[PDB]
Design a protein around this ligand. Structure first.
Ligand code: CLA
Ligand code: CLA
Ligand code: CLA
Ligand code: CLA
Ligand code: CLA
Ligand code: CLA
Ligand SMILES: CCCCCCCCCCCCCCCCCC(=O)OC[C@H](CO[C@@H]1O[C@H](CO)[C@H](O)[C@H](O)[C@H]1O)OC(=O)CCCCCCCCCCCCCCCCC
Ligand SMILES: CCCCCCCCCCCCCCCC(=O)OC[C@H](COP(=O)(O)OC[C@@H](O)CO)OC(=O)CCCCCCCCCCCCCCC
Ligand SMILES: CC(=O)O[C@H]1CC(C)(C)C(=C=C/C(C)=C/C=C/C(C)=C/C=C/C=C(C)/C=C/C=C(\C)C(=O)C[C@@]23O[C@]2(C)C[C@@H](O)CC3(C)C)[C@](C)(O)C1
Ligand SMILES: CC(=O)O[C@H]1CC(C)(C)C(=C=C/C(C)=C/C=C/C(C)=C/C=C/C=C(C)/C=C/C=C(\C)C(=O)C[C@@]23O[C@]2(C)C[C@@H](O)CC3(C)C)[C@](C)(O)C1
Ligand SMILES: CC(=O)O[C@H]1CC(C)(C)C(=C=C/C(C)=C/C=C/C(C)=C/C=C/C=C(C)/C=C/C=C(\C)C(=O)C[C@@]23O[C@]2(C)C[C@@H](O)CC3(C)C)[C@](C)(O)C1
Lengths: 173, 219, 167, 180
């Protein structure tokens, strides 16, 4: 049921014109739920990770042995991805590769009604937090991700097609 | 409960103002700890910032006024100036003497938050149902009487009808001098001198949030 | 088993019960509990002397050519400019010898129950009770544990800084 | 959860190698008992999990890892990397070999005969539960991580057999001609 779900706010309510929540079973909807939950958290970190990396925040010192943080007083934030060395790019994926495991190896997987993906390290005891005010936050968490999923696509389209975005094309990136 | 306990003391500080909450900050988890440790931590912080505030403003006035003459350090010892900015009298404190000011605070900040013991009584409550509390036990080590907040004891003569006139006042008393800091301490950094404020610490102080003006950096 | 009601020192800086056994060492290595106490008492004593022994050496120095401030500017270097000349070989010989002829028979007598751990026979000023002797034992444990962290900081910061008494 | 999920829930002993020593009366104690076969499988698995990760972490370029302790010898392949290290660092190589020699001797010195079911210890139980694990966990998890250790030991033993075959038979495993 789309009623009783965080993510249904005031200006639209149940937003499903093409009826995709009905398209599978209840296990199907739980997969799309934590997809959008995960699509949000990647896009929120990438949108915010685009705005800085563009104003010059600049970690002091050396990233690696000879490829130190000149990647910011230089090439666009969409770049500095091949400038990061391979052993540096490798440990990023593998910390993620580890983090995708505890996410999957809980006692009850979430499409069987289990909990949503939680923090891998330092997991405070969690949302023992007043479930009325818990529902307001999961609306806040998803809506900021909804806005960030659009925004990171704006940032790619501006870096590929100049003039594809009006009040944003006059920005050095 | 926790929402109901502010609205009882909302309508006592100012009945025209009443319940003040547009940013909705007193109902919600900090690091993930719940509503009952939410309000009491924010009822905590609003007065710790305010207890220093009265103690800052009285501490500001007397340093703009009559300075303290003796020998301050062991060699040389001139006592930085009288008329001069307590802002940069704080920077004209020697390097050593700022650490023991900060360390005795940390001895009192270690003191405030632990919780009652498992084999001896030493500490009071923290934020689970605790109030915004004082220190109340200064006898646990080999020391003499320098009870904190209690020099010459006598506060043993008031009841629950009369203590609410002392708690809720200091709330509002601490909010005044809190604004009394930033209303003045901006007026040295900028000109603008909120109604009129002129015969003052005449340049800006120089990074009023700095504990140490010169000696050690981080790069 | 359950080392905490078998010995003493389960106390923090206050004296409230602390029970510091996170890795369950005394449960997985239960026959080594006497050795664990013996070692900790040994390390603590070594540290308490080597703290005091150290940093009180930037003030005074016994007379002599090598001892009195000549070839040895600071207190921290005093190893590997003294090892070659003899006093470190001489002080290794005795601490060695002592360890090879009496404390290895001592730790043999502990494991047979013929000796309380960390005894060595220095009963000159003991309060000679049960409540008061534990308080002296605890005061030895709580001081020795602090001296281990102490010289860990003092020996590290003196190679880094190179300064006098405040390192 | 059972250890047999990939072979059909049943004990995979084709060629009946655990039943030998009991089929006939003809070699009296010349084949290993169940307790000795269980420790050999755990031990071969633990050495293979370390050795695969070793040849994987020191391979430079390709997929590779190229991580290298400063001060040690730079050697490309794992095939000759022991004998270079044995000649150049005698004190470090001798201290590792003595540590392995004592711990491996202590494994059997306190317990009985393993070759015969007379050991009085669980197979694989070296006194290395320092983290205090299995004293805090419950019995379902403790029995589970044993099977986790087993199958990961088993995946690494087959890996080490692939890693041996590719250098003795140059076209043996074809998934590594490409992978390098
Ligand atoms: C706590 C464990 C730990 C340790 C010991 C190291 C150690 C190291 N990291 Mg590091 N790293 C860690 C955790 C750790 N990391 C984590 C958790 C992350 C986030 C996923 C990273 C992300 C990271 C990046 C992005 C890079 C390193 C790099 C390096 C190496 C610098 C060598 C060099 O300059 O080239 C000699 C060094 C060996 C750099 C590297 O190897 O490339 C030069 C590099 O680029 N690290
Ligand atoms: C009873 C313990 C004790 C002792 C022995 C000292 C000793 C000292 N304090 Mg002191 N101090 C103490 C408690 C104590 N303090 C407490 C409880 C406070 C209140 C927070 C202060 C606040 C204080 C200030 C504000 C200053 C000192 C300074 C000094 C030192 C003078 C340094 C100098 O000129 O070098 C020769 C001196 C060593 C001064 C300092 O470090 O000068 C460089 C300095 O500025 N102290
Ligand atoms: C008009 C101002 C005012 C008033 C009514 C009070 C009134 C009170 N204070 Mg308070 N206090 C003040 C200024 C004031 N204080 C200042 C300026 C400081 C900082 C120097 C403090 C530091 C302080 C502490 C540290 C403690 C109090 C405590 C108390 C209570 C006894 C009482 C409600 C005690 C308390 O809360 O008792 C319940 C307590 O522990 N106050
Ligand atoms: C470390 C120095 C220090 C500090 C931080 C304070 C701070 C405080 N004292 Mg205190 N006091 C001190 C030294 C200090 N005094 C000394 C040396 C004297 C002279 C002996 C006094 C006399 C005095 C009286 C009567 C009272 C304080 C009170 C207070 C509280 C005032 C609000 C406040 C927490 C008073 C307060 O708020 O009354 C309840 C309080 O009890 N003490
Ligand atoms: C309004 C929020 C705010 C802001 C913006 C800052 C900003 C800063 N804080 Mg700060 N702080 C704040 C609130 C804030 N604080 C609060 C609420 C606390 C809790 C009490 C602290 C506690 C705190 C500590 C404990 C320390 C800082 C320090 C610093 C500085 C760190 C960067 C640095 O080393 O630059 C360089 C430093 C400065 C620009 C300020 C001092 C300048 C001196 C005079 C030297 C200037 C010369 C040179 C050009 C710069 C440094 C060189 C070096 C060799 C000295 C920076 C200016 C650190 C600091 O300033 O140490 C030097 C430090 O140790 N903060
Ligand atoms: C862990 C303990 C320890 C260690 C390893 C050292 C090591 C060293 N000290 Mg040193 N020292 C220590 C404690 C220690 N000290 C203590 C506690 C003091 C204060 C009395 C001193 C005072 C001291 C001075 C003044 C000098 C040294 C010096 C030296 C160096 C040369 C050896 C020498 O002449 O020793 C001399 C040692 C002493 C004079 C006192 C040692 C007392 C020991 C610890 C007594 C405990 C054991 C004892 C036999 C038990 C008897 C009890 C009885 C009931 C049976 C050497 C690096 C010399 C040097 O070259 O300076 C760099 C030097 O000039 N030390
Ligand atoms: C790159 C990886 C390499 C780095 C990682 C470190 C390696 C992993 C740790 C190895 C630990 C070795 C296994 C534990 C052996 C200790 C035996 C012991 O202490 O109690 C064993 C004995 C205790 O003796 C017992 O005492 C009891 C009384 O409580 C009873 O009397 C018992 O009968 C008696 O057996 O302690 C002794 O050591 C006395 C003999 C002295 C000689 C022992 C051999 C030398 C040991 C050196 C190795 C120590 C390893 C360091 C520890 C961790 C390393 C940081
Ligand atoms: C809690 C359990 C921990 C599990 C460990 C795994 C995650 C570890 C993350 C950090 C590694 C830190 C070790 C420090 C090592 C260190 O920092 O060395 C730095 C080293 C840099 O090597 P370079 O060749 O860049 O260096 C050459 C130069 O340094 C010489 O000039 O980087 C690494 O080798 C990257 C490690 C990635 C390893 C991937 C791990 C395994 C996952 C594989 C799964 C993928 C394939 C399967 C997909 C199905
Ligand atoms: C076309 C043109 O020219 O104009 C431009 C205009 C403009 C405005 C530039 C454009 C845009 C898009 C915008 C403005 C996009 C913004 C998107 C947005 C809103 C991105 C938020 C991310 C949230 C983060 C990072 C939060 C992390 C939060 C983290 C990591 C937490 O710690 C969670 C937290 O809860 C815990 C667990 C503890 C709590 O105590 C509270 C905190 C927070 C600590 C366009 C569309 O591109 C076009
Ligand atoms: C959800 C989660 O898990 O995350 C956790 C992480 C963690 C770390 C555990 C948490 C925390 C703690 C936090 C975030 C603490 C933050 C504290 C903070 C931000 C404290 C600022 C003080 C600034 C002051 C006093 C400024 C004075 C400024 C003064 C006096 C000025 O005059 C300013 C000045 O400009 C003038 C006006 C004039 C100019 O001429 C000169 C200068 C520049 C001097 C949280 C909250 O739990 C969240
Ligand atoms: C990949 C990587 O880089 O990682 C690194 C780090 C890692 C993993 C650490 C590495 C390593 C080194 C290793 C593996 C070293 C192993 C050392 C080892 C295996 C050392 C055993 C000691 C056994 C003792 C002392 C037994 C005492 C046994 C005792 C004290 C008992 O009495 C047991 C008793 O049981 C009875 C009989 C009955 C019970 O009722 C009561 C108890 C329990 C008390 C590597 C290889 O370097 C790789």
């Amino acid at each position: 049921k789309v009623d009783e779900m965080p993510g249904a706010t005031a200006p639209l309510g149940k937003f499903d014109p093409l009826n995709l929540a009905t398209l599978g079973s209840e296990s199907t909807l739980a997969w799309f739920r934590a997809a959008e939950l995960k699509h949000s958290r990647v896009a929120m970190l990438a949108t915010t990770g685009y705005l800085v990396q563009a104003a010059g925040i600049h970690f002091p010192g050396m990233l690696s042995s000879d490829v130190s943080f000149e990647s910011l007083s230089a090439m666009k934030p969409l770049d500095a991805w091949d400038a990061v060395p391979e052993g540096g790019k490798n440990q990023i994926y593998f910390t993620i590769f580890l983090a995708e495991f505890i996410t999957e190896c809980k006692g009850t997987h979430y499409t069987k009604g289990g909990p949503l993906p939680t923090i891998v390290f330092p997991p405070i005891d969690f949302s023992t937090v007043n479930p009325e005010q818990l529902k307001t936050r999961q609306n806040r968490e998803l809506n900021n991700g909804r806005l960030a999923m659009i925004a990171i696509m704006s940032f790619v389209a501006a870096a590929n097609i100049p003039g594809s975005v009006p009040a944003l094309a006059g920005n050095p990136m | 409960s926790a929402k109901a306990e502010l609205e009882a003391i909302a309508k006592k500080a100012n009945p025209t103002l009443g319940y003040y909450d547009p940013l909705s900050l007193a109902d919600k988890d900090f690091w993930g700890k719940g509503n009952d440790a939410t309000i009491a931590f924010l009822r905590q912080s609003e007065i710790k910032h305010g207890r220093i505030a009265m103690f800052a403003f009285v501490g500001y006035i007397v340093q703009s006024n009559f300075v303290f003459p003796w020998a301050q350090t062991l060699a040389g010892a001139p006592h930085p100036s009288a008329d001069l900015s307590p802002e940069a009298q704080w920077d004209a404190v020697p390097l050593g003497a700022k650490w023991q000011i900060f360390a005795v605070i940390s001895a009192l900040e270690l003191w405030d938050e632990c919780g009652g013991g498992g084999a001896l009584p030493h500490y009071t409550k923290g934020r689970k149902p605790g109030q915004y509390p004082p220190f109340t036990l200064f006898r646990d080590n080999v020391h003499f009487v320098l009870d904190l907040y209690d020099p010459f004891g006598f506060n043993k003569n008031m009841s629950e009808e009369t203590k609410e006139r002392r708690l809720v006042s200091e709330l509002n008393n601490g909010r005044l001098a809190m604004l009394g800091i930033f209303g003045f301490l901006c007026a040295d950094t900028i000109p603008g001198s909120v109604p009129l404020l002129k015969d003052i610490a005449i340049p800006y102080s120089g990074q009023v949030m700095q504990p140490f003006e010169g000696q050690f950096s981080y790069f | 088993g359950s080392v905490f009601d078998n010995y003493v020192g389960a106390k923090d800086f206050r004296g409230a019960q602390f029970k510091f056994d996170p890795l369950k060492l005394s449960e997985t290595y239960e026959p080594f509990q006497g050795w664990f106490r013996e070692s900790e008492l040994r390390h603590g004593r070594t540290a308490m002397l080597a703290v005091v022994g150290y940093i009180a050496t930037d003030f005074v120095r016994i007379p002599g050519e090598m001892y009195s401030f000549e070839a040895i500017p600071k207190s921290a270097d005093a190893h590997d400019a003294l090892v070659a000349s003899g006093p470190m070989s001489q002080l290794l010989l005795w601490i060695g010898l002592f360890d090879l002829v009496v404390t290895a028979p001592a730790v043999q007598a502990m494991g047979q129950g013929e000796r309380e751990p960390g005894d060595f026979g220095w009963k000159w000023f003991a309060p000679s009770s049960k409540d008061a002797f534990d308080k002296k034992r605890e005061a030895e444990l709580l001081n020795g544990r602090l001296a281990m962290f102490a010289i860990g900081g003092i020996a590290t910061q003196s190679v880094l800084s190179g300064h006098g008494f405040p390192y | 959860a059972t250890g047999f999920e990939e072979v059909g829930g049943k004990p995979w002993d084709p060629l009946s190698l655990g039943k030998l020593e009991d089929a006939n009366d003809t070699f009296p104690n010349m084949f290993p008992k169940s307790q000795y076969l269980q420790e050999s499988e755990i031990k071969h698995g633990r050495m293979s999990m370390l050795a695969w990760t070793g040849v994987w972490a020191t391979h430079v370029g390709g997929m590779g890892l190229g991580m290298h302790i400063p001060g040690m010898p730079v050697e490309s392949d794992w095939t000759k990397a022991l004998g270079v290290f044995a000649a150049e660092q005698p004190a470090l190589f001798g201290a590792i070999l003595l540590f392995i020699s004592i711990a491996e001797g202590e494994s059997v010195g306190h317990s009985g005969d393993n070759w015969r079911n007379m050991s009085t210890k669980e197979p694989g139980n070296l006194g290395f539960d320092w983290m205090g694990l299995t004293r805090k966990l419950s019995e379902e998890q403790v029995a589970r991580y044993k099977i986790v250790e087993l199958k990961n030991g088993r995946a690494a033993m087959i890996a080490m057999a692939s890693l041996f075959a590719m250098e003795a038979i140059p076209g043996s495993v074809p998934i590594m001609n490409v992978f390098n």
